[PDB]
Amino acid sequence: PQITLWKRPLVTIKIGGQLKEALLDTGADDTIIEEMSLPGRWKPKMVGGIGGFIKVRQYDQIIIEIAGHKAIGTVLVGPTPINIIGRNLLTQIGATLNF
Amino acid sequence: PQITLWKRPLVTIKIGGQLKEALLDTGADDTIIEEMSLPGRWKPKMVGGIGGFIKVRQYDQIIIEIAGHKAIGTVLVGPTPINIIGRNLLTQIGATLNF
Ligand SMILES: CC(C)CN(C[C@@H](O)[C@@H](Cc1ccccc1)NC(=O)O[C@H]1CO[C@H]2OCC[C@H]21)S(=O)(=O)c1ccc(N)cc1
Ligand SMILES: CC(C)CN(C[C@@H](O)[C@H](Cc1ccccc1)NC(=O)O[C@H]1CO[C@H]2OCC[C@H]21)S(=O)(=O)c1ccc(N)cc1
């Protein structure tokens, strides 16, 4: 698709059997969601934002569908105020910013 | 242009007559710039992101050139670690996400 930005660019995502949605965020290096069901063991990691730094749970090799495109990569679980798809996965679905 | 997302999508901006650079951020509702002087009366606001809230000054109807394209709109000024162009100005230059 070609998505305009008059509202937040939210898309469906699917991980395992869970359908969620998330914000396509070109300002995010990393993908972060609030919860992922039965994800297994994780590794601690720190991530920084506008307000300071947060501890997250890092899961690698996650298979995720984004807007009907398959991606595989690192998904962080942490106290983000909204699920975000960051550039580590946006590149895999071939998203670009255009103007 | 078409911007791929293998690195942060930073572009040149011009604001207050000064050349700066800023992140094109589809995940940001509003534009936030580091400390600088702007014209007009401002209003106090708070903005929330990862890791918490920050206090900003809101200035309205500010001209900003974004990679050669003129935009006019709301600009928040405050202790962000990076200049961010949010959707409020991305929409004025017709920026879209494509995949
Ligand atoms: C964009 C910033 C300037 C915002 N200011 C916030 C303020 O806490 C900081 C913002 C600040 C601080 C330093 C450098 C840049 C910005 N301090 C400041 O302006 O200086 C005063 C604080 O102690 C002293 O330092 C010099 C005189 C005093 S503010 O206009 O007073 C304001 C306060 C509350 C909200 N919600 C929104 C804005
Ligand atoms: C978290 C999003 C819902 C909102 N944020 C925009 C987002 O693009 C920020 C924009 C950003 C970018 C750099 C530093 C601070 C904020 N990126 C971010 O927090 O990414 C974090 C996860 O990946 C990491 O890569 C960047 C830091 C990590 S935000 O900066 O807090 C913000 C919130 C409201 C407005 N008006 C403007 C910006």
Side-chain angles (χ1 to χ4, degrees), chain A residues 1-3 5-9 24-27 29 32 49-51 69 87 91 94-99, chain B residues 1-3 5-9 24-27 29 32 49-51 54 87 91 95-99:
Chain A
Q2 171 166 23
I3 306 190
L5 295 170
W6 298 107
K7 61 182 180 142
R8 296 172 170 214
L24 304 185
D25 189 353
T26 59
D29 295 348
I32 314 181
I50 203 145
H69 295 260
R87 293 186 297 98
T91 54
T96 57
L97 193 61
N98 294 76
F99 55 88
Chain B
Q2 184 164 276
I3 299 179
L5 294 165
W6 304 102
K7 61 191 195 303
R8 295 187 175 191
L24 296 188
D25 191 351
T26 61
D29 297 335
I32 315 173
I50 280 170
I54 59 165
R87 295 190 292 106
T91 51
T96 50
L97 277 168
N98 291 259
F99 61 95

mmCIF file of all heavy atoms in Angstrom, chain A residues 1-3 5-9 24-27 29 32 49-51 69 87 91 94-99, chain B residues 1-3 5-9 24-27 29 32 49-51 54 87 91 95-99:
data_model
loop_
_atom_site.group_PDB
_atom_site.id
_atom_site.type_symbol
_atom_site.label_atom_id
_atom_site.label_comp_id
_atom_site.label_asym_id
_atom_site.label_seq_id
_atom_site.Cartn_x
_atom_site.Cartn_y
_atom_site.Cartn_z
ATOM 1 N N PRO A 1 0.814 -1.220 0.000
ATOM 2 C CA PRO A 1 0.000 0.000 0.000
ATOM 3 C C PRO A 1 0.846 1.270 0.000
ATOM 4 O O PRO A 1 2.060 1.219 0.219
ATOM 5 C CB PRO A 1 -0.759 -0.106 1.326
ATOM 6 C CG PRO A 1 0.118 -0.894 2.235
ATOM 7 C CD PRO A 1 1.097 -1.646 1.389
ATOM 8 N N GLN A 2 0.175 2.389 -0.255
ATOM 9 C CA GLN A 2 0.813 3.687 -0.064
ATOM 10 C C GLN A 2 0.043 4.407 1.041
ATOM 11 O O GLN A 2 -1.106 4.771 0.791
ATOM 12 C CB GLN A 2 0.833 4.485 -1.350
ATOM 13 C CG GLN A 2 1.285 5.926 -1.175
ATOM 14 C CD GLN A 2 1.608 6.586 -2.509
ATOM 15 O OE1 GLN A 2 1.109 6.147 -3.551
ATOM 16 N NE2 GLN A 2 2.400 7.658 -2.451
ATOM 17 N N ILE A 3 0.646 4.557 2.211
ATOM 18 C CA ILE A 3 -0.037 5.024 3.409
ATOM 19 C C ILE A 3 0.214 6.492 3.703
ATOM 20 O O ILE A 3 1.358 6.868 3.913
ATOM 21 C CB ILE A 3 0.428 4.170 4.612
ATOM 22 C CG1 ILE A 3 0.250 2.664 4.364
ATOM 23 C CG2 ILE A 3 -0.250 4.565 5.900
ATOM 24 C CD1 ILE A 3 0.452 1.795 5.591
ATOM 25 N N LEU A 5 -0.419 9.893 6.269
ATOM 26 C CA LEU A 5 -0.115 10.003 7.706
ATOM 27 C C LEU A 5 -1.053 10.903 8.497
ATOM 28 O O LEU A 5 -0.728 11.443 9.570
ATOM 29 C CB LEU A 5 1.347 10.482 7.842
ATOM 30 C CG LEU A 5 2.323 9.423 7.282
ATOM 31 C CD1 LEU A 5 3.725 10.012 7.188
ATOM 32 C CD2 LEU A 5 2.339 8.168 8.138
ATOM 33 N N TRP A 6 -2.264 11.098 7.954
ATOM 34 C CA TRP A 6 -3.250 11.944 8.629
ATOM 35 C C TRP A 6 -3.720 11.292 9.923
ATOM 36 O O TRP A 6 -4.127 11.998 10.835
ATOM 37 C CB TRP A 6 -4.454 12.181 7.710
ATOM 38 C CG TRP A 6 -4.080 12.912 6.450
ATOM 39 C CD1 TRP A 6 -3.979 12.433 5.187
ATOM 40 C CD2 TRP A 6 -3.743 14.306 6.367
ATOM 41 N NE1 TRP A 6 -3.602 13.420 4.299
ATOM 42 C CE2 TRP A 6 -3.457 14.576 5.010
ATOM 43 C CE3 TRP A 6 -3.666 15.323 7.314
ATOM 44 C CZ2 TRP A 6 -3.094 15.850 4.589
ATOM 45 C CZ3 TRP A 6 -3.305 16.589 6.887
ATOM 46 C CH2 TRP A 6 -3.024 16.839 5.523
ATOM 47 N N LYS A 7 -3.651 9.968 10.006
ATOM 48 C CA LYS A 7 -3.868 9.290 11.287
ATOM 49 C C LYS A 7 -2.706 8.363 11.596
ATOM 50 O O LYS A 7 -1.892 8.145 10.681
ATOM 51 C CB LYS A 7 -5.174 8.495 11.186
ATOM 52 C CG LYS A 7 -5.151 7.415 10.101
ATOM 53 C CD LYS A 7 -6.522 6.727 10.050
ATOM 54 C CE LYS A 7 -6.540 5.650 8.976
ATOM 55 N NZ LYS A 7 -7.311 4.441 9.383
ATOM 56 N N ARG A 8 -2.581 7.837 12.808
ATOM 57 C CA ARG A 8 -1.454 6.921 13.026
ATOM 58 C C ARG A 8 -1.435 5.735 12.077
ATOM 59 O O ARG A 8 -2.502 5.134 11.835
ATOM 60 C CB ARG A 8 -1.519 6.402 14.482
ATOM 61 C CG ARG A 8 -1.345 7.514 15.500
ATOM 62 C CD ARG A 8 -1.609 6.945 16.890
ATOM 63 N NE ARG A 8 -1.216 7.914 17.922
ATOM 64 C CZ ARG A 8 -0.709 7.525 19.094
ATOM 65 N NH1 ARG A 8 -0.546 6.234 19.365
ATOM 66 N NH2 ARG A 8 -0.364 8.428 20.004
ATOM 67 N N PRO A 9 -0.264 5.386 11.549
ATOM 68 C CA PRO A 9 -0.164 4.256 10.606
ATOM 69 C C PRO A 9 -0.129 2.925 11.332
ATOM 70 O O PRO A 9 0.896 2.292 11.532
ATOM 71 C CB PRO A 9 1.143 4.527 9.847
ATOM 72 C CG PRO A 9 1.985 5.323 10.779
ATOM 73 C CD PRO A 9 1.059 6.016 11.741
ATOM 74 N N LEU A 24 3.500 1.547 12.615
ATOM 75 C CA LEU A 24 4.699 1.589 11.778
ATOM 76 C C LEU A 24 5.482 2.865 12.114
ATOM 77 O O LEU A 24 4.968 3.965 11.858
ATOM 78 C CB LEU A 24 4.355 1.551 10.299
ATOM 79 C CG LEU A 24 3.515 0.378 9.802
ATOM 80 C CD1 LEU A 24 3.388 0.442 8.277
ATOM 81 C CD2 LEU A 24 4.065 -0.983 10.188
ATOM 82 N N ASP A 25 6.664 2.667 12.704
ATOM 83 C CA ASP A 25 7.391 3.776 13.316
ATOM 84 C C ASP A 25 8.789 3.919 12.723
ATOM 85 O O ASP A 25 9.715 3.208 13.116
ATOM 86 C CB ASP A 25 7.454 3.489 14.817
ATOM 87 C CG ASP A 25 7.991 4.654 15.628
ATOM 88 O OD1 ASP A 25 8.437 5.623 14.981
ATOM 89 O OD2 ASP A 25 7.918 4.555 16.879
ATOM 90 N N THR A 26 8.943 4.839 11.770
ATOM 91 C CA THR A 26 10.267 5.032 11.168
ATOM 92 C C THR A 26 11.283 5.671 12.114
ATOM 93 O O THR A 26 12.494 5.606 11.822
ATOM 94 C CB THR A 26 10.160 5.910 9.910
ATOM 95 O OG1 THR A 26 9.581 7.188 10.254
ATOM 96 C CG2 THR A 26 9.284 5.221 8.884
ATOM 97 N N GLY A 27 10.798 6.219 13.218
ATOM 98 C CA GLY A 27 11.668 6.795 14.229
ATOM 99 C C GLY A 27 12.172 5.803 15.267
ATOM 100 O O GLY A 27 12.909 6.240 16.159
ATOM 101 N N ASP A 29 14.318 2.421 16.087
ATOM 102 C CA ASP A 29 15.317 1.482 15.597
ATOM 103 C C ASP A 29 14.793 0.055 15.751
ATOM 104 O O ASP A 29 15.060 -0.791 14.907
ATOM 105 C CB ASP A 29 16.598 1.608 16.420
ATOM 106 C CG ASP A 29 17.343 2.931 16.309
ATOM 107 O OD1 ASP A 29 17.068 3.770 15.427
ATOM 108 O OD2 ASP A 29 18.265 3.147 17.142
ATOM 109 N N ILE A 32 8.986 -3.104 19.444
ATOM 110 C CA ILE A 32 8.678 -3.313 20.856
ATOM 111 C C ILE A 32 7.168 -3.514 20.989
ATOM 112 O O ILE A 32 6.422 -2.688 20.459
ATOM 113 C CB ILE A 32 9.103 -2.136 21.754
ATOM 114 C CG1 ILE A 32 10.508 -1.610 21.477
ATOM 115 C CG2 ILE A 32 8.933 -2.505 23.230
ATOM 116 C CD1 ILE A 32 10.969 -0.460 22.357
ATOM 117 N N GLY A 49 14.332 6.223 25.026
ATOM 118 C CA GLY A 49 13.224 6.943 24.426
ATOM 119 C C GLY A 49 13.360 8.412 24.795
ATOM 120 O O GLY A 49 14.363 8.797 25.391
ATOM 121 N N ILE A 50 12.346 9.193 24.462
ATOM 122 C CA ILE A 50 12.337 10.617 24.767
ATOM 123 C C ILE A 50 12.406 10.862 26.268
ATOM 124 O O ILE A 50 13.069 11.816 26.702
ATOM 125 C CB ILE A 50 11.083 11.272 24.165
ATOM 126 C CG1 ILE A 50 11.261 12.776 23.932
ATOM 127 C CG2 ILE A 50 9.841 10.988 24.991
ATOM 128 C CD1 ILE A 50 10.533 13.251 22.693
ATOM 129 N N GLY A 51 11.768 10.021 27.081
ATOM 130 C CA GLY A 51 11.707 10.288 28.519
ATOM 131 C C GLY A 51 12.809 9.666 29.359
ATOM 132 O O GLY A 51 12.881 9.973 30.560
ATOM 133 N N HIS A 69 2.720 -9.307 5.356
ATOM 134 C CA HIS A 69 4.086 -9.591 4.939
ATOM 135 C C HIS A 69 4.840 -10.298 6.068
ATOM 136 O O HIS A 69 4.766 -9.896 7.226
ATOM 137 C CB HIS A 69 4.892 -8.341 4.604
ATOM 138 C CG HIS A 69 4.332 -7.626 3.418
ATOM 139 N ND1 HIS A 69 4.884 -7.758 2.164
ATOM 140 C CD2 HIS A 69 3.269 -6.795 3.300
ATOM 141 C CE1 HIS A 69 4.179 -7.017 1.321
ATOM 142 N NE2 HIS A 69 3.189 -6.414 1.975
ATOM 143 N N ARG A 87 12.559 -0.085 12.573
ATOM 144 C CA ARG A 87 13.208 -0.280 11.284
ATOM 145 C C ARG A 87 13.789 -1.687 11.119
ATOM 146 O O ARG A 87 13.950 -2.112 9.979
ATOM 147 C CB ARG A 87 14.326 0.785 11.100
ATOM 148 C CG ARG A 87 13.800 2.199 10.971
ATOM 149 C CD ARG A 87 14.900 3.222 10.633
ATOM 150 N NE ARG A 87 15.874 3.287 11.702
ATOM 151 C CZ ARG A 87 17.050 2.673 11.772
ATOM 152 N NH1 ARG A 87 17.471 1.909 10.777
ATOM 153 N NH2 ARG A 87 17.823 2.837 12.841
ATOM 154 N N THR A 91 12.489 -2.777 7.274
ATOM 155 C CA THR A 91 13.322 -3.111 6.108
ATOM 156 C C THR A 91 12.978 -4.467 5.508
ATOM 157 O O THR A 91 13.109 -4.701 4.300
ATOM 158 C CB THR A 91 14.808 -3.098 6.507
ATOM 159 O OG1 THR A 91 15.023 -3.956 7.624
ATOM 160 C CG2 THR A 91 15.199 -1.683 6.942
ATOM 161 N N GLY A 94 10.165 -4.328 3.214
ATOM 162 C CA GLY A 94 10.470 -3.410 2.123
ATOM 163 C C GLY A 94 9.738 -2.079 2.207
ATOM 164 O O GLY A 94 9.456 -1.468 1.177
ATOM 165 N N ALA A 95 9.424 -1.606 3.418
ATOM 166 C CA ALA A 95 8.832 -0.280 3.568
ATOM 167 C C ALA A 95 9.834 0.819 3.260
ATOM 168 O O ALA A 95 11.021 0.822 3.593
ATOM 169 C CB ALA A 95 8.335 -0.070 4.986
ATOM 170 N N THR A 96 9.349 1.862 2.590
ATOM 171 C CA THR A 96 10.143 3.047 2.352
ATOM 172 C C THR A 96 9.301 4.272 2.708
ATOM 173 O O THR A 96 8.068 4.195 2.723
ATOM 174 C CB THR A 96 10.583 3.202 0.882
ATOM 175 O OG1 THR A 96 9.399 3.214 0.059
ATOM 176 C CG2 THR A 96 11.444 2.057 0.401
ATOM 177 N N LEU A 97 9.964 5.374 2.982
ATOM 178 C CA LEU A 97 9.351 6.672 3.184
ATOM 179 C C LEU A 97 9.515 7.437 1.883
ATOM 180 O O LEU A 97 10.621 7.459 1.327
ATOM 181 C CB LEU A 97 9.929 7.385 4.403
ATOM 182 C CG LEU A 97 9.216 8.622 4.949
ATOM 183 C CD1 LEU A 97 7.799 8.297 5.398
ATOM 184 C CD2 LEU A 97 9.993 9.240 6.106
ATOM 185 N N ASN A 98 8.439 8.033 1.403
ATOM 186 C CA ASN A 98 8.469 8.730 0.139
ATOM 187 C C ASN A 98 7.857 10.110 0.227
ATOM 188 O O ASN A 98 6.826 10.269 0.880
ATOM 189 C CB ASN A 98 7.629 7.932 -0.885
ATOM 190 C CG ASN A 98 8.320 6.593 -1.134
ATOM 191 O OD1 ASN A 98 8.227 5.719 -0.269
ATOM 192 N ND2 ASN A 98 8.972 6.528 -2.263
ATOM 193 N N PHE A 99 8.482 11.072 -0.452
ATOM 194 C CA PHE A 99 7.840 12.374 -0.639
ATOM 195 C C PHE A 99 8.438 13.094 -1.852
ATOM 196 O O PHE A 99 9.160 12.457 -2.636
ATOM 197 C CB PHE A 99 7.936 13.243 0.610
ATOM 198 C CG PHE A 99 9.338 13.439 1.122
ATOM 199 C CD1 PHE A 99 10.091 14.499 0.628
ATOM 200 C CD2 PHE A 99 9.872 12.581 2.068
ATOM 201 C CE1 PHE A 99 11.390 14.697 1.064
ATOM 202 C CE2 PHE A 99 11.165 12.785 2.517
ATOM 203 C CZ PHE A 99 11.911 13.825 2.001
ATOM 204 N N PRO B 1 11.903 12.135 -2.726
ATOM 205 C CA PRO B 1 12.769 10.959 -2.812
ATOM 206 C C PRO B 1 12.085 9.731 -2.211
ATOM 207 O O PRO B 1 11.004 9.832 -1.659
ATOM 208 C CB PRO B 1 13.979 11.329 -1.951
ATOM 209 C CG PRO B 1 13.434 12.299 -0.958
ATOM 210 C CD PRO B 1 12.348 13.064 -1.668
ATOM 211 N N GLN B 2 12.758 8.602 -2.349
ATOM 212 C CA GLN B 2 12.396 7.347 -1.716
ATOM 213 C C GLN B 2 13.453 7.030 -0.665
ATOM 214 O O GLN B 2 14.655 6.975 -0.953
ATOM 215 C CB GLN B 2 12.264 6.254 -2.773
ATOM 216 C CG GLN B 2 11.798 4.905 -2.220
ATOM 217 C CD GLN B 2 11.309 3.990 -3.326
ATOM 218 O OE1 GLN B 2 10.149 4.065 -3.741
ATOM 219 N NE2 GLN B 2 12.204 3.128 -3.807
ATOM 220 N N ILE B 3 13.035 6.871 0.582
ATOM 221 C CA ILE B 3 14.026 6.670 1.636
ATOM 222 C C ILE B 3 13.903 5.258 2.188
ATOM 223 O O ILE B 3 12.850 4.870 2.708
ATOM 224 C CB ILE B 3 13.827 7.729 2.732
ATOM 225 C CG1 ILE B 3 14.001 9.145 2.178
ATOM 226 C CG2 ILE B 3 14.722 7.487 3.936
ATOM 227 C CD1 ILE B 3 13.793 10.246 3.179
ATOM 228 N N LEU B 5 15.155 2.231 4.925
ATOM 229 C CA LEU B 5 15.205 2.386 6.375
ATOM 230 C C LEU B 5 16.298 1.587 7.068
ATOM 231 O O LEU B 5 16.177 1.267 8.248
ATOM 232 C CB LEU B 5 13.810 2.019 6.933
ATOM 233 C CG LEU B 5 12.720 3.014 6.484
ATOM 234 C CD1 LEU B 5 11.332 2.419 6.735
ATOM 235 C CD2 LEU B 5 12.879 4.354 7.194
ATOM 236 N N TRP B 6 17.358 1.317 6.285
ATOM 237 C CA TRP B 6 18.503 0.603 6.831
ATOM 238 C C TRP B 6 19.285 1.476 7.820
ATOM 239 O O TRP B 6 19.984 0.916 8.659
ATOM 240 C CB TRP B 6 19.460 0.129 5.726
ATOM 241 C CG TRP B 6 18.787 -0.720 4.702
ATOM 242 C CD1 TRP B 6 18.385 -0.336 3.454
ATOM 243 C CD2 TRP B 6 18.442 -2.103 4.846
ATOM 244 N NE1 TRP B 6 17.803 -1.398 2.806
ATOM 245 C CE2 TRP B 6 17.828 -2.491 3.641
ATOM 246 C CE3 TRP B 6 18.595 -3.031 5.881
ATOM 247 C CZ2 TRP B 6 17.360 -3.788 3.428
ATOM 248 C CZ3 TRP B 6 18.124 -4.324 5.658
ATOM 249 C CH2 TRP B 6 17.519 -4.678 4.452
ATOM 250 N N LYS B 7 19.143 2.793 7.730
ATOM 251 C CA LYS B 7 19.670 3.676 8.760
ATOM 252 C C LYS B 7 18.543 4.647 9.149
ATOM 253 O O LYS B 7 17.513 4.638 8.474
ATOM 254 C CB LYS B 7 20.927 4.428 8.315
ATOM 255 C CG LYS B 7 20.665 5.320 7.111
ATOM 256 C CD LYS B 7 22.014 5.814 6.582
ATOM 257 C CE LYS B 7 21.855 6.982 5.637
ATOM 258 N NZ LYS B 7 20.987 6.678 4.478
ATOM 259 N N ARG B 8 18.740 5.440 10.187
ATOM 260 C CA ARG B 8 17.739 6.435 10.582
ATOM 261 C C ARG B 8 17.450 7.410 9.452
ATOM 262 O O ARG B 8 18.362 7.898 8.772
ATOM 263 C CB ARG B 8 18.223 7.203 11.818
ATOM 264 C CG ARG B 8 18.374 6.350 13.066
ATOM 265 C CD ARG B 8 18.690 7.195 14.284
ATOM 266 N NE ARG B 8 18.699 6.309 15.462
ATOM 267 C CZ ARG B 8 18.733 6.767 16.708
ATOM 268 N NH1 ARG B 8 18.750 8.083 16.880
ATOM 269 N NH2 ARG B 8 18.743 5.935 17.748
ATOM 270 N N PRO B 9 16.181 7.702 9.175
ATOM 271 C CA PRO B 9 15.815 8.641 8.099
ATOM 272 C C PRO B 9 15.940 10.086 8.529
ATOM 273 O O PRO B 9 14.989 10.784 8.844
ATOM 274 C CB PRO B 9 14.338 8.279 7.788
ATOM 275 C CG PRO B 9 13.837 7.787 9.105
ATOM 276 C CD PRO B 9 14.977 7.098 9.797
ATOM 277 N N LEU B 24 12.700 11.847 10.343
ATOM 278 C CA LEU B 24 11.338 11.753 9.821
ATOM 279 C C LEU B 24 10.614 10.627 10.529
ATOM 280 O O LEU B 24 10.987 9.463 10.298
ATOM 281 C CB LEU B 24 11.422 11.478 8.327
ATOM 282 C CG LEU B 24 12.072 12.617 7.554
ATOM 283 C CD1 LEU B 24 11.926 12.354 6.061
ATOM 284 C CD2 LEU B 24 11.464 13.952 7.944
ATOM 285 N N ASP B 25 9.645 10.953 11.384
ATOM 286 C CA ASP B 25 9.173 9.947 12.316
ATOM 287 C C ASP B 25 7.678 9.676 12.206
ATOM 288 O O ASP B 25 6.901 10.447 12.771
ATOM 289 C CB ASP B 25 9.499 10.421 13.731
ATOM 290 C CG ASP B 25 9.285 9.328 14.765
ATOM 291 O OD1 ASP B 25 8.728 8.277 14.382
ATOM 292 O OD2 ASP B 25 9.664 9.509 15.935
ATOM 293 N N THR B 26 7.315 8.589 11.516
ATOM 294 C CA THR B 26 5.890 8.262 11.391
ATOM 295 C C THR B 26 5.237 7.885 12.725
ATOM 296 O O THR B 26 4.001 7.881 12.840
ATOM 297 C CB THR B 26 5.712 7.130 10.357
ATOM 298 O OG1 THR B 26 6.410 5.947 10.792
ATOM 299 C CG2 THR B 26 6.286 7.535 8.996
ATOM 300 N N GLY B 27 6.007 7.552 13.756
ATOM 301 C CA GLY B 27 5.552 7.150 15.072
ATOM 302 C C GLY B 27 5.303 8.353 15.969
ATOM 303 O O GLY B 27 4.821 8.165 17.081
ATOM 304 N N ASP B 29 3.259 11.798 16.696
ATOM 305 C CA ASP B 29 2.112 12.592 16.298
ATOM 306 C C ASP B 29 2.527 14.026 15.948
ATOM 307 O O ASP B 29 1.957 14.570 14.997
ATOM 308 C CB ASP B 29 1.081 12.703 17.421
ATOM 309 C CG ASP B 29 0.449 11.403 17.859
ATOM 310 O OD1 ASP B 29 0.382 10.413 17.094
ATOM 311 O OD2 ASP B 29 -0.038 11.399 19.018
ATOM 312 N N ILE B 32 8.902 17.685 17.389
ATOM 313 C CA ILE B 32 9.606 18.180 18.573
ATOM 314 C C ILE B 32 11.051 18.525 18.238
ATOM 315 O O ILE B 32 11.782 17.726 17.653
ATOM 316 C CB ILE B 32 9.650 17.195 19.751
ATOM 317 C CG1 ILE B 32 8.340 16.500 20.061
ATOM 318 C CG2 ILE B 32 10.173 17.938 20.983
ATOM 319 C CD1 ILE B 32 8.406 15.407 21.105
ATOM 320 N N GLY B 49 6.445 9.415 25.850
ATOM 321 C CA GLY B 49 7.040 8.473 24.913
ATOM 322 C C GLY B 49 7.595 7.322 25.739
ATOM 323 O O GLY B 49 7.221 7.129 26.902
ATOM 324 N N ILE B 50 8.527 6.597 25.117
ATOM 325 C CA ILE B 50 9.145 5.522 25.911
ATOM 326 C C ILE B 50 9.919 6.127 27.071
ATOM 327 O O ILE B 50 10.662 7.095 26.923
ATOM 328 C CB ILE B 50 10.042 4.650 25.024
ATOM 329 C CG1 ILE B 50 9.199 3.638 24.231
ATOM 330 C CG2 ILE B 50 11.123 3.948 25.824
ATOM 331 C CD1 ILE B 50 9.953 2.890 23.155
ATOM 332 N N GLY B 51 9.750 5.552 28.255
ATOM 333 C CA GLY B 51 10.549 6.033 29.372
ATOM 334 C C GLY B 51 9.957 7.242 30.041
ATOM 335 O O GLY B 51 10.525 7.777 30.990
ATOM 336 N N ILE B 54 8.006 14.447 29.032
ATOM 337 C CA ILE B 54 8.824 15.646 29.058
ATOM 338 C C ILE B 54 7.919 16.876 28.852
ATOM 339 O O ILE B 54 6.857 16.726 28.263
ATOM 340 C CB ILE B 54 9.933 15.682 27.997
ATOM 341 C CG1 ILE B 54 9.448 15.571 26.546
ATOM 342 C CG2 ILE B 54 10.979 14.602 28.311
ATOM 343 C CD1 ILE B 54 10.533 15.966 25.556
ATOM 344 N N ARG B 87 3.984 13.472 12.350
ATOM 345 C CA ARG B 87 2.971 13.441 11.294
ATOM 346 C C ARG B 87 2.348 14.803 10.990
ATOM 347 O O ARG B 87 1.943 15.064 9.849
ATOM 348 C CB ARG B 87 1.865 12.438 11.691
ATOM 349 C CG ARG B 87 2.372 11.005 11.759
ATOM 350 C CD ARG B 87 1.219 10.018 11.910
ATOM 351 N NE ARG B 87 0.608 10.191 13.233
ATOM 352 C CZ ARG B 87 -0.568 10.777 13.432
ATOM 353 N NH1 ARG B 87 -1.288 11.255 12.418
ATOM 354 N NH2 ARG B 87 -1.021 10.883 14.678
ATOM 355 N N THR B 91 2.484 15.239 6.911
ATOM 356 C CA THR B 91 1.305 15.299 6.045
ATOM 357 C C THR B 91 1.315 16.513 5.118
ATOM 358 O O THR B 91 0.713 16.463 4.054
ATOM 359 C CB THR B 91 -0.024 15.381 6.830
ATOM 360 O OG1 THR B 91 0.087 16.436 7.787
ATOM 361 C CG2 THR B 91 -0.279 14.097 7.606
ATOM 362 N N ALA B 95 4.192 13.184 2.641
ATOM 363 C CA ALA B 95 5.019 11.984 2.832
ATOM 364 C C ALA B 95 4.146 10.754 3.040
ATOM 365 O O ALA B 95 3.114 10.834 3.689
ATOM 366 C CB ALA B 95 5.948 12.171 4.012
ATOM 367 N N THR B 96 4.539 9.609 2.507
ATOM 368 C CA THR B 96 3.773 8.383 2.637
ATOM 369 C C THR B 96 4.745 7.240 2.975
ATOM 370 O O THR B 96 5.935 7.299 2.669
ATOM 371 C CB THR B 96 2.998 7.921 1.378
ATOM 372 O OG1 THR B 96 3.912 7.929 0.260
ATOM 373 C CG2 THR B 96 1.857 8.833 0.986
ATOM 374 N N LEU B 97 4.192 6.205 3.586
ATOM 375 C CA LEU B 97 4.862 4.936 3.807
ATOM 376 C C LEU B 97 4.408 3.969 2.708
ATOM 377 O O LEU B 97 3.215 3.871 2.438
ATOM 378 C CB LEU B 97 4.542 4.294 5.151
ATOM 379 C CG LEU B 97 5.354 4.781 6.347
ATOM 380 C CD1 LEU B 97 4.699 4.256 7.621
ATOM 381 C CD2 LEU B 97 6.817 4.357 6.238
ATOM 382 N N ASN B 98 5.371 3.311 2.101
ATOM 383 C CA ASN B 98 5.047 2.440 0.962
ATOM 384 C C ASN B 98 5.628 1.055 1.197
ATOM 385 O O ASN B 98 6.796 0.935 1.578
ATOM 386 C CB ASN B 98 5.616 3.043 -0.320
ATOM 387 C CG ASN B 98 4.897 4.322 -0.725
ATOM 388 O OD1 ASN B 98 4.052 4.320 -1.615
ATOM 389 N ND2 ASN B 98 5.212 5.439 -0.070
ATOM 390 N N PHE B 99 4.821 0.033 0.941
ATOM 391 C CA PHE B 99 5.458 -1.296 0.840
ATOM 392 C C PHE B 99 4.589 -2.275 0.065
ATOM 393 O O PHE B 99 3.493 -1.885 -0.366
ATOM 394 C CB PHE B 99 5.792 -1.805 2.242
ATOM 395 C CG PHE B 99 4.541 -1.954 3.080
ATOM 396 C CD1 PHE B 99 3.905 -3.182 3.162
ATOM 397 C CD2 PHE B 99 4.035 -0.861 3.756
ATOM 398 C CE1 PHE B 99 2.753 -3.276 3.933
ATOM 399 C CE2 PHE B 99 2.895 -0.965 4.529
ATOM 400 C CZ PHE B 99 2.251 -2.185 4.596
#
